Design a protein around this ligand. Structure first.
Ligand SMILES: *[C@@H]1O[C@H](CO)[C@@H](O[C@@H]2O[C@H](CO)[C@@H](O[C@H]3O[C@H](CO)[C@@H](O)[C@H](O)[C@@H]3O)[C@H](O)[C@H]2NC(C)=O)[C@H](O)[C@H]1NC(C)=O
Ligand SMILES: *[C@@H]1O[C@H](CO)[C@@H](O[C@@H]2O[C@H](CO)[C@@H](O[C@H]3O[C@H](CO)[C@@H](O)[C@H](O)[C@@H]3O)[C@H](O)[C@H]2NC(C)=O)[C@H](O)[C@H]1NC(C)=O
Ligand SMILES: *[C@@H]1O[C@H](CO)[C@@H](O[C@@H]2O[C@H](CO)[C@@H](O)[C@H](O)[C@H]2NC(C)=O)[C@H](O)[C@H]1NC(C)=O
Ligand SMILES: *[C@@H]1O[C@H](CO)[C@@H](O[C@@H]2O[C@H](CO)[C@@H](O)[C@H](O)[C@H]2NC(C)=O)[C@H](O)[C@H]1NC(C)=O
Ligand SMILES: *[C@@H]1O[C@H](CO)[C@@H](O)[C@H](O)[C@H]1NC(C)=O
Ligand SMILES: *[C@@H]1O[C@H](CO)[C@@H](O)[C@H](O)[C@H]1NC(C)=O
Ligand SMILES: *[C@@H]1O[C@H](CO)[C@@H](O)[C@H](O)[C@H]1NC(C)=O
Ligand SMILES: *[C@@H]1O[C@H](CO)[C@@H](O)[C@H](O)[C@H]1NC(C)=O
Ligand SMILES: *[C@@H]1O[C@H](CO)[C@@H](O)[C@H](O)[C@H]1NC(C)=O
Ligand SMILES: *[C@@H]1O[C@H](CO)[C@@H](O)[C@H](O)[C@H]1NC(C)=O
Lengths: 510, 654
């Protein structure tokens, strides 16, 4: 039996404490049924927090400690770093606040924040930007600390980025109490960019969004992309937050607090029981309320040598040497036009799965806006011209000179409710000519493969294929090995043919 | 309207002077209702109770600032760090005046920390002028693995990048650990003379004693550190002639207290006349919110240009640290620490004496020592490189040309056969041939010795995001050169723009092209056959991995499909591919014109087809910015003038 500490630090109602304490002993599903002792600080201050910590340190032989916090505090992470450095104690963080990742850590610390590094979030968001291939983007930050590291990170990613990713403008602004609007609000008014990437705090984001709405830089044709620090309280997004905001978080965002606590306890217990397997011994207890013994424990080193590569219930909860997580699964979340946060994509194992082949740019009055230039493109598979294949599995996505394409949804039963959409690599003669058309006429496009049959024929008096998708307004334009005939011509318009063909009789030479 | 200031000192006596210091403020500025007051404590070895008292005594009181100093026991960042955390919870400023740790320079973790002494990393900027003063270009960096060392390394990297220059290499080490003499050895076979170091006192002493074991104390070699590395045991093991930087104040805690009190009083008066100062949280317990005017007080502290300090102008930098600081240049002469100059900005000023260099000389040594023994790396290529096993006696066979002269052969070391199939025995073997002949000629022309050793992997190489990595990294001889294993390449290497960014190609020494080889009926249509354009299972073809042709087929995306064919059957060397084509395991091989025509004129039974779809040169490559490029360029020019390379070809191609 291992004794652990479940620390509550998000204030809130006091009903949380007992409603978690009775379930603390209800963890029988996990090996070596844990003896968790929980405590909750209703004041959330360094003195009381340290008092509880040191009291539980002197209370009994505890091995691992987990802590939860409210979504708008930062110093508690550093306080627990001090605890785990001075006392050499393994700890874990959950919920808002402490889960924020601090790239520098004291060498003697073992606090091991449970979150995602900022640069990894940048990697995910630039991959998403590649999905909608918006090479033009503007960098907008405030004078909030860490923005130097943020600009270093964006410089590093853009430097490691493949395409000539246009940094339209890198700029820093003043946010907080009031602030000078002169040459800063006018600076906003002179900023000209359709895609913006931001970095600031939660209330800084609240103020900046209000200014941007007051700046006139809001609405369709203006997209924002912000990190986790800017966002907060996904349940309660303020009115200042514009619709169509994008970020990426952990899958546990939607889980309940009890589930998060149980998962943290499970990870701790699995590390402990892996130690128990390999070395046949229970984990070495932690330090004391008073001063520290000195050097690191070799058994604590064993816990830090089997802890970093732990998994539980399908999820590999691996950690980075920087006291945070490495390549976990992430959910790309997006604020909708209903002022609600839902799932727009998923980044897992270096793979992006989005439910939106195109980005919906809803306008101010809660209505979608359709671009004139962007246009739905439909086709049928054909080896000489319409080459379809699986996306490159080694690196994800598609190779160059190839377009991402999709099946004709699954509208026979799934009219667009299947969020994992099977991407395909579409390349060929028709792909090349449509690429040239796009690069000349300067219009976007949306490609998807048609499934309901073949080219198209009036069946039972109604048409099908690309002919159906276009004549019945389900699509805009169709391309492929399409022959022009009158029966095809009365109901739909054709351009001038580009490559001539005809009927032919094929035979064996011998 | 009452004000109070918190102090955490170590002497327990300056505290009383601190009591005077606030009085000094009340004696330097008006009293009125400002009610300038003082509060002081001494930190404890156990920081828990220290922070608890800080809450129950300072935050609980009307304290608007906190200062801290260093304890007599050497622990540094051990003591003040929890304070930096505590202040962060309430955004109150904290002033640490006796710390050289760059960790405190962070604003993300230490929100409201300030220092009037720049950290050890800022010392880098100091030495930045050294090389500028004495015109030193070849600079070698050696740094500990500690974060302070990493910060100093990146700071000096930025500085040297400002002049669009670079250190020729940087090396890292662990603190107080075991074998370090490998680094000092590779420093011996390095090029530079002037060395710069950064470590702890015990670490510096270990480096000193190891370098003394390795004769690094001799003339020409120069070392450069701060004041940490020249104390105690490190000072004892530091040889004479070492140059160091000294703080003008160093340990005058009284001057630091006076200047801090003055600037604090000035900032407090400015805040009071700017009003809306709110109040301290009045206790850690209970009050859980942040202090709103904390950022405002921090920014006015940033702009607090209190120039009336005892140390002169107390000017904060961008990060809130002392800017245009004062230091002195000291030279260790005959066990005496002698000063030679002063530093306060963009220009060191000499004051007295002369620099007694570590080798005991009086003249300023140059920054490098050109090594007349260069490094030769290559790959075995029969048209250009012949490699044979030496006899039991370990020499080359007395094999003479048809004209009767012996072939000039050397002893190139390296693995006995390819590493996966080999037991990884770096067996020296006889090697000779065209490239060998020309390198011997140009060496006789420049009169320099050399060392011959073929490439480890056997592949040419390219930038690649290798497994478990992120940055595209070279391999092959380009990687071996960029690492410094070899200093210049001698091989029928192809010039490409990708290599051009990293390896200095001289003028081409030979011209050649790219073509296709088959056996002995569908004469292949060069690079215009559809049967290439749409790959077939009946026709199998490939090239060498990490090679120039791979780069070419990668650039032309229109050819990418054949590149997709490449990754199926790509070979690793010319011999196996040639035999397989002779065995019809492969159908056609894309490679150099010269290689294919050579084997055809010697082996027969196989023919090249199609024209030289890509013409280029084989040019002798070498390291960037090394002086020898112009010499070898004009040498190969004059060799083309008298046709000596043509004579070489007639010796090797009949
Ligand atoms: C393409 O040509 C096909 C043959 O000329 C023909 O498709 C066939 O259409 C019939 C429609 O009656 C399908 O039969 C379906 O309905 C019967 C009952 O009426 C069921 O018993 C069957 O199981 C089936 O559900 C055929 O299955 C279908 N054949 C194929 C191969 O699809 C249409 O003229 C054209 N069809 C399409 C899809 O383009
Ligand atoms: C070839 O390499 C050389 C060394 O890397 C260098 O050119 C050399 O420059 C020195 C300096 O002038 C010449 O030395 C002559 O001049 C000095 C100063 O007057 C005298 O003290 C010497 O005794 C000597 O007379 C070298 O002669 C000269 N080397 C050559 C081959 O000319 C350049 O990097 C390269 N220069 C050329 C021309 O290839
Ligand atoms: C001026 O400063 C002195 C010392 O810093 C204060 O004296 C202490 O005040 C605290 C709380 O204000 C008490 O808990 C201590 O018992 C006091 N000690 C002594 C020796 O007096 C004093 O209160 C401050 N006064 C003002 C007006 O700021
Ligand atoms: C430490 O610095 C203090 C000043 O902060 C020195 O005290 C005075 O320094 C001035 C310098 O111009 C002298 O003129 C005074 O005579 C000093 N006062 C006294 C009472 O001597 C102090 O001397 C310095 N001490 C050391 C060891 O550096
Ligand atoms: C984690 O890694 C260690 C070695 O680093 C290994 O022994 C262990 O089997 C791995 N898996 C665990 C602890 O579940
Ligand atoms: C390490 O280097 C060599 C062997 O690697 C050894 O002779 C030397 O004494 C060692 N030096 C130190 C400082 O450990
Ligand atoms: C150091 O110099 C001495 C002679 O002064 C020599 O015998 C010894 O081999 C040298 N050792 C090294 C490592 O340079
Ligand atoms: C110390 O630096 C200050 C900053 O300007 C200035 O007084 C001077 O450069 C130095 N002090 C003296 C006495 O030279
Ligand atoms: C640097 O030092 C000199 C001499 O102490 C002093 O005048 C001033 O602080 C600085 N002078 C210059 C020219 O930088
Ligand atoms: C021999 O080589 C040395 C150094 O490489 C050079 O100084 C000298 O001039 C050379 N002598 C001849 C005759 O080339």
């Amino acid at each position: 039996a291992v004794t652990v500490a479940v620390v509550f630090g998000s204030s809130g109602p006091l009903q949380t404490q007992a409603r978690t304490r009775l379930t603390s002993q209800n963890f029988l599903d996990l090996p070596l049924e844990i003896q968790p002792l929980t405590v909750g600080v209703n004041n959330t201050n360094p003195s009381s927090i340290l008092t509880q910590i040191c009291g539980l340190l002197g209370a009994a032989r505890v091995h691992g400690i987990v802590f939860e916090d409210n979504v708008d505090t930062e110093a508690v992470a550093q306080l627990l770093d001090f605890v785990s450095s001075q006392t050499h104690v393994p700890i874990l963080s959950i919920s808002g606040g402490s889960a924020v990742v601090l790239t520098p850590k004291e060498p003697g610390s073992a606090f091991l924040q449970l979150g995602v590094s900022l640069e990894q979030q940048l990697q995910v968001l630039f991959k998403v930007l590649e999905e909608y291939d918006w090479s033009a983007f503007a960098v907008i930050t405030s004078l909030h600390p860490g923005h130097a590291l943020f600009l270093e990170g964006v410089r590093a990613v853009a430097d490691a980025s493949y395409l000539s990713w246009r940094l339209l403008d890198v700029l820093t602004l003043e946010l907080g109490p009031g602030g000078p609007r002169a040459r800063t609000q006018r600076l906003l008014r002179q900023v000209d960019a359709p895609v913006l990437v931001a970095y600031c705090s939660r209330e800084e984001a609240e103020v900046l969004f209000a200014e941007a709405a007051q700046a006139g830089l809001v609405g369709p044709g203006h997209v924002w992309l912000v990190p986790n620090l800017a966002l907060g309280s996904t349940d309660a997004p303020p009115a200042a937050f514009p619709v169509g905001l994008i970020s990426v978080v952990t899958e546990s965002w939607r889980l309940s607090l009890r589930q998060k606590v149980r998962d943290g306890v499970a990870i701790l217990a699995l590390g402990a029981h892996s130690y128990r397997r390999q070395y046949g011994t229970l984990p070495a207890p932690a330090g004391d309320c008073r001063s520290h013994p000195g050097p690191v424990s070799p058994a604590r080193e064993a816990f830090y040598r089997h802890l970093l590569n732990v998994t539980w219930e399908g999820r590999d909860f691996s950690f980075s040497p920087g006291g945070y997580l490495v390549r976990p699964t992430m959910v790309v979340i997006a604020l909708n036009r209903h002022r609600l946060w839902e799932m727009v994509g998923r980044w897992d194992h270096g793979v992006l799965y989005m439910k939106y082949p195109v980005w919906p740019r809803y306008s101010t009055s809660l209505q979608p806006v359709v671009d004139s230039r962007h246009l739905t493109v439909a086709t049928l598979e054909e080896r000489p011209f319409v080459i379809v294949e699986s996306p490159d599995p080694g690196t994800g996505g598609c190779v160059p000179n190839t377009v991402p394409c999709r099946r004709q949804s699954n509208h026979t039963f799934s009219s667009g409710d299947l969020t994992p959409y099977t991407k395909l690599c579409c390349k060929g003669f028709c792909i090349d000519i449509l690429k040239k058309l796009a690069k000349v006429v300067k219009f976007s496009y949306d490609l998807y493969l048609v499934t309901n049959g073949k080219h198209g024929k009036r069946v039972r008096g109604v048409w099908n294929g690309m002919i159906g998708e276009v004549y019945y307004k389900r699509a805009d334009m169709a391309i492929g090995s399409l022959t022009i005939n009158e029966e095809r011509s009365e109901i739909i318009d054709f351009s001038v043919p580009f490559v001539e063909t005809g009927i032919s009789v094929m035979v064996s030479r011998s | 309207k009452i004000v109070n200031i918190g102090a955490v000192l170590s002497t327990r006596k300056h505290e009383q002077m601190f009591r005077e210091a606030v009085n000094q403020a009340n004696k330097r500025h008006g009293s009125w209702k400002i009610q300038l007051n003082a509060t002081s404590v001494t930190h404890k070895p156990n920081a828990i109770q220290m922070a608890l008292s800080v809450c129950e005594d300072l935050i609980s009181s009307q304290v608007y600032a906190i200062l801290v100093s260093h304890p007599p026991t050497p622990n540094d960042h051990f003591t003040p760090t929890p304070v930096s955390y505590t202040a962060g919870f309430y955004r109150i400023p904290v002033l640490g005046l006796t710390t050289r740790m760059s960790i405190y320079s962070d604003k993300s973790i230490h929100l409201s920390f300030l220092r009037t002494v720049p950290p050890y990393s800022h010392q880098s900027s100091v030495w930045f002028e050294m090389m500028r003063v004495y015109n030193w270009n070849h600079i070698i960096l050696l740094v500990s693995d500690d974060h302070e060392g990493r910060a100093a390394q990146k700071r000096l990297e930025t500085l040297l990048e400002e002049r669009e220059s670079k250190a020729e290499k940087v090396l890292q080490f662990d603190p107080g650990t075991k074998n370090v003499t490998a680094l000092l050895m590779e420093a011996r076979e390095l090029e530079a003379r002037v060395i710069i170091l950064s470590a702890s006192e015990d670490d510096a002493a270990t480096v000193y004693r190891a370098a003394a074991m390795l004769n690094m104390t001799g003339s020409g070699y120069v070392w450069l550190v701060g004041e940490r590395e020249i104390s105690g045991n490190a000072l004892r093991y530091a040889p004479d002639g070492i140059i160091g930087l000294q703080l003008i104040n160093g340990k005058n805690e009284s001057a630091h207290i006076s200047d801090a009190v003055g600037v604090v009083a000035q900032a407090v008066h400015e805040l009071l006349e700017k009003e809306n100062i709110t109040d301290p949280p009045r206790g850690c317990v209970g009050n859980t919110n942040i202090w709103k005017t904390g950022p405002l007080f921090k920014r006015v502290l940033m702009s607090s240009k209190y120039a009336d300090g005892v140390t002169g102008r107390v000017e904060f930098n961008e990060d809130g640290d002392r800017k245009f600081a004062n230091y002195s240049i000291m030279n260790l002469q005959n066990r005496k620490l002698v000063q030679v100059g002063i530093y306060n900005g963009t220009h060191v000023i000499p004051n007295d004496r002369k620099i007694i260099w570590p080798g005991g000389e009086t003249e300023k040594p140059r920054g490098y020592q050109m090594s007349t023994r260069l490094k030769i790396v290559t790959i075995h290529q029969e048209p250009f490189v012949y490699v044979k096993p030496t006899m039991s006696d370990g020499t080359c066979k007395e094999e003479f040309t048809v004209n009767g002269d012996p072939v000039k052969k050397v002893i190139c070391t390296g693995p006995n056969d390819t590493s996966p199939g080999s037991p990884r025995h770096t067996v020296p073997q006889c090697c000779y041939g065209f490239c060998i002949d020309l390198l011997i000629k140009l060496a006789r022309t420049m009169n320099f010795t050399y060392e011959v050793h073929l490439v480890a992997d056997g592949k040419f190489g390219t930038q690649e995001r290798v497994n478990n990595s992120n940055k595209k990294e070279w391999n092959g001889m380009m990687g071996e050169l960029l690492s410094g294993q070899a200093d210049m390449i001698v091989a029928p290497l192809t010039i490409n723009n990708e290599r051009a960014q990293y390896i200095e190609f001289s003028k081409p020494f030979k011209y050649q092209g790219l073509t296709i080889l088959v056996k002995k009926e569908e004469r292949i249509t060069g690079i215009n056959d559809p049967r290439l354009r749409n790959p077939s299972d009946k026709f199998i073809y490939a090239t060498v991995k990490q090679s120039s042709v791979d780069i070419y087929f990668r650039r032309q995306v229109e050819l990418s499909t054949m590149y997709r064919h490449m990754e199926k059957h790509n070979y690793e060397s010319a011999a196996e591919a040639i035999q397989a084509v002779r065995d019809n395991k492969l159908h056609a091989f894309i490679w150099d014109s010269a290689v294919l025509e050579f084997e055809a004129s010697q082996k027969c039974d196989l023919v090249t087809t199609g024209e030289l779809f890509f013409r280029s040169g084989f040019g002798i490559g070498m390291r960037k910015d090394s002086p020898w490029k112009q010499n070898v360029s004009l040498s190969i020019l004059k060799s083309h003038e008298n046709g000596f390379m043509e004579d070489l070809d007639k010796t090797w191609v009949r």
